[model samples]
Target: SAIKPDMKIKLRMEGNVNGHHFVIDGDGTGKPFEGKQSMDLEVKEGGPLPFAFDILTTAFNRVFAKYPDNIQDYFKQSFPKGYSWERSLTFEDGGICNARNDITMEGDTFYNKVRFYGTNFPANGPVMQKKTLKWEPATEKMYVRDGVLTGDVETALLLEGNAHYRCDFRTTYKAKEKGVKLPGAHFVDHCIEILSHDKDYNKVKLYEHAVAHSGLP
Candidate 1:
């Protein structure tokens, strides 16, 4: 099935991270901290189905727009110094194309993937992430996939290879610790089912919801 421009689909997503307990003290005497935080978001029909990619790219670019000073200051204050962020929209017509803050509609569903990279720290000291969202008509359900701790496209592709006629989208992420040799990252997944396609294009009434959680341990 192909997504038509006039066709709209609502979306809802929820993400969670777990297994992050660490001993910060030198002798491992400090108390272990473990928890998670999440964010919930809504995307109207025709709205950006893959919002994580869009939102994260926007936020990263906002920080980089200020350049060296802002980036340096952020790192000094314990924030990651973002280097670059890019988004891609894949189309059945040919191949994937670069994009930013936009949606790529096929028939009734839209999809997008984003990748982010940072610099100036340590060897292998950067992060990469991706996100994909899908909306289906038959089931009226949306699918979301997020990657953290690591970015492996092959794995993701394998997992999604068996998708229905039209799959939503997916994402990946990689986090390199400041000093630790090990990298910490994860892949969070989410999705929403479509209840109604709506008859009126302008008055389209797509309904969807989302949730995201994150924290440090």
Candidate 2:
């Protein structure tokens, strides 16, 4: 049985600073806001890639075992330090969306929306926030239409006629904050299209790949 569109999945975002405490909140639709998940660590001056990757990888491992238990160890071995970025793209298209606000369901086929703050790359600035860009699950295959930066970074998979799965990585740099900027702030984003018919499965794989491959040159 293939997973249908419009299904919802619980998503949790955990943020941390190398030396300081951080916080995580729900979408704020009257959902009880959970307290901050604490980590005793030192806040260092750097980008948010490493921290973001850690949080994301941890979450995915808890939810799905697409990779072996030792995979996390392998990731640490690959990128021993510094900042890096990664993302997971779900194929479901459910929930609510308007020009200003959106609440996406799991397995929705859409563009990049989730943003991780505090990173070093993109050379524009720190990640203030992030979101998931999703569309109607039944909609036709389309390039990333939302988010700040736009282009076909996932050209390999996208042009190959694989539309069920698509994901992107974004990093923002120091730039004047404004309302009209197409990308809002100076940033760099890349995309990877996964091949899957079920959105939920597609998303799970996307997350796993990001965690395993995120690192420096």
Candidate 3:
């Protein structure tokens, strides 16, 4: 079915950094804090990069940057804190607000747990970040010295994302990779490399007026 301006993109991410060892504390899930399963981790690469970083970052960017308008703008209307926000059309000439893009996220999740090698990250760079890691097709070593998740680089209007991995920081260690347990909820994601889309979503003005990343000269 075509996007109905009610399309939603829901993403849940978490990770823990442990250079070498993984600490396992099993007492259950939530409570005396011992019931806690895990925590929030940034999604990025680390020195001697773990194999999982790239796979997920790609996923992050895909949804954040490439998602349909219904999914993208729906997210924009609800920034983390600004989720409770307001906007309107007050021009002497009002067009069509029905053209407003919409989408949402509920249940389901996309997160991961990996390893990195950064016992002594650079003074200014463990730098495996997406914006400034300095990508080089010739640089050897797939290892990540650092990782990063830039601020609100993109609101519900754009899709740019990231992560971190390690430890037993899982809210649902049993959540599994297939994204199970969600009900009446529609979702698309992965540790960092996944997907979903909608029709009519491609015509969003926000994106229509935007440049195509791949088409740039």
Each prediction's number of clashing residue pairs: 44, 28, 37
Candidates in order, TM-scores: namely 0.25, 0.20, 0.20
Per-residue accuracy of model 1 over 1-217 as CA lDDT, tens digit each? 1212133222222221111111110000100011111122232233322112221211111111111221121111212321222333232222232322222333343222222222221222111121223332211111223432221221111113453222222222222224312223322222332233222211212222222122222
lDDT of 3 by residue, 59-91 (tens): 111113233332223222332211211112111
Which is better, 2 or 3, measured by lDDT? 2
Per-residue C-alpha lDDT of model 2 across residues 78-178, encoded as one tens digit per residue: 11121122433221222111111122323322111222333222222121121222221111121223442222222111211234323232221111223
RMSD of each: 19.9, 19.4, 21.1
Q: What RMSD does model 3 have?
A: 21.1
Worst 10 residues of 3 by lDDT: 27-36
Instruction: Assess the local accuracy of residue 23 in candidate 2 as a C-alpha lDDT between 0 and 100.
Output: 32
Rank order (by lDDT, best first): 2, 1, 3
CA lDDT, candidate 3, residue 90:
18
- Whole-model lDDT, model 2: 0.23
Best by TM-score: 1
**Between candidates 1 and 2, which one is better according to TM-score?**
1
